[PDB]
Design an enzyme around this catalytic site. Structure first.
Site, short mmCIF file in Angstrom:
data_model
loop_
_atom_site.label_atom_id
_atom_site.label_comp_id
_atom_site.label_asym_id
_atom_site.label_seq_id
_atom_site.Cartn_x
_atom_site.Cartn_y
_atom_site.Cartn_z
NE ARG A 1 21.28 -3.69 22.29
CZ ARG A 1 20.18 -2.96 22.10
NH1 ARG A 1 19.82 -2.06 23.00
NH2 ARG A 1 19.46 -3.12 21.00
CG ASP B 1 29.58 -5.43 14.23
OD1 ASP B 1 28.40 -5.83 14.19
OD2 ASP B 1 29.90 -4.22 14.14
CG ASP C 1 30.86 -9.65 10.10
OD1 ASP C 1 29.70 -9.85 10.54
OD2 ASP C 1 31.20 -8.58 9.55
C1 LIG Z 1 31.42 -1.41 8.07
C2 LIG Z 1 31.47 -0.63 9.39
C3 LIG Z 1 30.45 0.53 9.45
N1 LIG Z 1 32.80 0.02 9.53
C4 LIG Z 1 33.82 -0.67 10.17
N2 LIG Z 1 35.06 -0.03 10.24
C5 LIG Z 1 36.04 -0.67 10.85
N3 LIG Z 1 37.33 -0.06 10.93
N4 LIG Z 1 35.95 -1.93 11.43
C6 LIG Z 1 34.73 -2.61 11.39
O1 LIG Z 1 34.69 -3.72 11.91
C7 LIG Z 1 33.65 -1.91 10.72
N5 LIG Z 1 32.40 -2.52 10.64
C8 LIG Z 1 31.27 -1.59 10.59
C9 LIG Z 1 29.91 -2.34 10.59
O2 LIG Z 1 28.88 -1.68 10.51
N6 LIG Z 1 29.90 -3.70 10.70
C10 LIG Z 1 28.64 -4.48 10.74
C11 LIG Z 1 28.88 -5.86 10.10
N7 LIG Z 1 27.58 -6.32 9.51
C12 LIG Z 1 27.59 -7.80 9.31
C13 LIG Z 1 26.83 -8.34 10.52
S1 LIG Z 1 25.55 -9.55 10.12
C14 LIG Z 1 23.93 -8.77 9.86
C15 LIG Z 1 23.17 -9.76 8.97
O3 LIG Z 1 24.09 -10.25 8.02
C16 LIG Z 1 23.77 -11.58 7.71
N8 LIG Z 1 24.98 -12.27 7.28
C17 LIG Z 1 25.19 -12.69 5.95
N9 LIG Z 1 26.37 -13.28 5.77
C18 LIG Z 1 26.97 -13.25 7.03
C19 LIG Z 1 28.22 -13.72 7.45
N10 LIG Z 1 29.03 -14.34 6.52
N11 LIG Z 1 28.59 -13.57 8.76
C20 LIG Z 1 27.69 -12.95 9.59
N12 LIG Z 1 26.47 -12.44 9.32
C21 LIG Z 1 26.13 -12.62 8.00
C22 LIG Z 1 23.12 -12.23 8.96
O4 LIG Z 1 22.17 -13.16 8.59
C23 LIG Z 1 22.59 -11.00 9.73
O5 LIG Z 1 21.21 -11.09 9.64
C24 LIG Z 1 27.14 -5.66 8.26
P1 LIG Z 1 28.31 -5.92 6.87
O6 LIG Z 1 29.46 -4.82 7.23
O7 LIG Z 1 27.77 -5.39 5.56
O8 LIG Z 1 29.09 -7.22 6.88
#
Ligand SMILES: CC1(C)Nc2nc(N)[nH]c(=O)c2N=C1C(=O)NCCN(CCSC[C@H]1O[C@@H](n2cnc3c(N)ncnc32)[C@H](O)[C@@H]1O)CP(=O)(O)O
Length: 158
Positions: free
Chosen positions: A82, A95, A97
């Site tokens: 933040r 973020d 990942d």
């Molecule tokens: C997508 C969206 C809206 N649009 C975007 N557009 C562009 N241009 N660029 C971007 O960058 C981008 N990203 C945006 C986003 O909102 N991004 C959030 C990432 N967010 C994962 C964070 S971990 C939360 C939980 O996830 C669990 N977790 C499970 N596996 C892992 C892992 N391998 N690494 C890390 N954390 C893990 C962990 O325990 C925690 O409690 C959910 P997701 O998008 O669904 O990945």
């Protein structure tokens, strides 16, 4: 273990945020950055109301366990995540990942490696392809192949 980490910030001004992140990644115990991809300006995946993302990839050498590394990435997202507006703190705009952790497959409550949707995400695949173009996924798929098959649009550099 080479862990590959995806970085995202959607601030209007994320450069300072991403650089603070890369130093924190570098300060993780028993870990150091091997390589950094270029910085890319990508349109967000989702509601197109939010600003463009700055996306990039990072090769991290580490002797840490994967869940331990995750604790560190989540701590940084808490600490650097933040930034202050005058009234209050704003919502977090970092973020981190874990795309890959060596050749390991992981499916737990906390962790899904490879990252579950990276295969549909150009803003993850291209930066990664820049720093590891011969990368092979644990199930034998190639990063180059997946970019070939879907023909994702290249990214504009930030
Ligand atoms: C997508 C969206 C809206 N649009 C975007 N557009 C562009 N241009 N660029 C971007 O960058 C981008 N990203 C945006 C986003 O909102 N991004 C959030 C990432 N967010 C994962 C964070 S971990 C939360 C939980 O996830 C669990 N977790 C499970 N596996 C892992 C892992 N391998 N690494 C890390 N954390 C893990 C962990 O325990 C925690 O409690 C959910 P997701 O998008 O669904 O990945």
């Amino acid at each position: 273990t080479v862990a590959y980490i995806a970085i995202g910030s959607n601030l209007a001004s994320p450069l300072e945020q991403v650089n603070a992140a890369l130093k924190a990644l570098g300060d993780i115990p028993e870990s150091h950055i091997l390589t950094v991809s270029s910085f890319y300006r990508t349109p967000p995946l989702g509601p197109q109301d939010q600003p463009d993302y700055l996306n990039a990839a990072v090769a991290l050498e580490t002797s840490l366990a994967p869940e331990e590394l995750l604790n560190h990435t989540q701590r940084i997202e808490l600490q650097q995540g933040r930034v202050r507006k005058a009234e209050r703190w704003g919502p977090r705009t970092l973020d981190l990942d874990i795309m890959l952790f060596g050749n390991e497959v992981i499916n737990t409550e906390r962790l899904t490696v490879p990252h579950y949707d990276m295969k549909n995400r150009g803003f993850m695949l291209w930066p990664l392809f820049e720093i590891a173009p011969e990368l092979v996924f644990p199930d034998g798929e190639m990063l180059r192949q997946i970019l070939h098959t879907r023909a994702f649009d290249k990214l504009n550099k930030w």
